[PDB]
Amino acid sequence: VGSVAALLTVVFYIAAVMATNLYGATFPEWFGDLSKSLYTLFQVMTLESWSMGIVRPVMNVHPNAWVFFIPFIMLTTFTVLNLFIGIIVDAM
Ligand X SMILES: CCCCCCCCCC(=O)N(CCO)C[C@@H](O)[C@@H](O)[C@@H](O)[C@@H](O)CO
Which residues are at the interface with ligand X (CB under 6 A)?
A: 12, 33, 35-36, 38-39, 42, 59, 63-64, 66, 70
With CB under 5 to 8 Å by kind, the binding choice for 67 among ligand X, Na ion, a copy of itself, none is none
Query: What residues make contact with a copy of itself under the rule CB under 8 A?
Result: 39, 42-43, 46-53, 66, 70, 73, 78, 81-82, 84-85, 87-88
**61: burial class by Cβ within 10 Å (0-12, 13-18, 19+)?**
exposed
CA trace torsion 49, 39, 7, 57 (10° rounding): 40
> Considering beta carbons, is residue 80 or 86 the nearer one to ligand X?
80
CB 44 within 8 A of CB 68: no
Tell me which residues touch Na ion (CB under 5 A).
47, 49
